[PDB]
Amino acid sequence: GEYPTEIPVGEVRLYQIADGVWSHIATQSFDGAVYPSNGLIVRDGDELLLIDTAWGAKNTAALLAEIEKQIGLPVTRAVSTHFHDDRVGGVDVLRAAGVATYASPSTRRLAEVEGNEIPTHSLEGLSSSGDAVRFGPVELFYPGAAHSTDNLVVYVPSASVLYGGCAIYELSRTSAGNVADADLAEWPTSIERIQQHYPEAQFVIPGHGLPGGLDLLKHTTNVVKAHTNRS
Ligand SMILES: O=C(O)[C@H]1CCCCN1C(=O)[C@@H](CS)Cc1ccccc1
Numbered sequence: 018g019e020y021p022t023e024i025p026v027g028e029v030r031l032y033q034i035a036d037g038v039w040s041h042i043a044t045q046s047f048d049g050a051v052y053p054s055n056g057l058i059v060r061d062g063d064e065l066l067l068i069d070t071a072w073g074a075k076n077t078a079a080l081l082a083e084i085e086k087q088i089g090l091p092v093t094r095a096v097s098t099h100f101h102d103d104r105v106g107g108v109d110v111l112r113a114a115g116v117a118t119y120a121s122p123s124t125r126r127l128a129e130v131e132g133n134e135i136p137t138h139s140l141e142g143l144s145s146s147g148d149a150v151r152f153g154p155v156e157l158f159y160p161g162a163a164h165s166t167d168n169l170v171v172y173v174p175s176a177s178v179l180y181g182g183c184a185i186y187e188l189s190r191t192s193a194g195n196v197a198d199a200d201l202a203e204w205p206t207s208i209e210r211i212q213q214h215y216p217e218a219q220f221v222i223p224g225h226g227l228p229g230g231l232d233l234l235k236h237t238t239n240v241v242k243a244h245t246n247r248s
Pocket residue numbers: 052101102103164183193194195196225
């Protein structure tokens with residue numbers, strides 16, 4: 018029961034999941050309510066891989082300061098898992114600090130169209146549903162369209178940690194979130210692909226809220242199908 022929930026906006030908290038694996042947790046206010054957001058940090062030798070910004074430039078500056086204070090290793094690369102602002106908002110801060118920023122070509126194009134910040138580098142090998150590539154200490158996986166058409170998930174083999182980003186919902190969320198960019202028809206099949214490729218996952222991190230087990234995948238499918246049938 019130690020995962021942070023406790024976090025004023027502008028602040029960022031780190032949570033150690035395993036040796037060399039942390040999540041980062043930040044908050045943002047939207048329509049008068051406060052939402053948490055998760056990302057991932059993975060050690061690779063004496064450097065760090067960052068997965069996703071902390072949802073905004075100010076939060077992302079605080080994230081880098083937090084990392085410097087608590088871990089003290091340099092973030093040398095970062096990956097954004099889809100084109101929304103809680104994933105790419107802060108890429109310019111990362112870039113100014115010397116972090117090499119990455120995303121899939123689809124994510125970079127969608128970010129551009131949205132007027133969002135655009136990661137510098139393009140990830141190859143992730144164009145088709147079911148594609149996976151090794152990227153430093155993690156595997157990147159494109160499960161197919163779900164929360165967005167471009168969304169990636171991240172697996173840490175040394176720790177059996179599956180980071181689902183916003184394609185996976187926390188258990189406390191029982192109604193669909195922002196699905197304006199989603200492929201509702203394909204989302205359960207994409208979740209099916211995650212389960213098929215990472216059935217040994219022990220720790221599953223949603224894009225927002227509390228980690229759990231692989232039960233978060235069927236929970237998300239249930240919420241998405243209920244939203245599909247809404248009326
Ligand atoms: O996915 C979701 O569950 C919904 C609802 C729960 C929190 C996050 N959330 C959001 O929308 C975030 C990041 S995805 C804000 C956003 C703004 C503009 C465009 C996309 C997203």
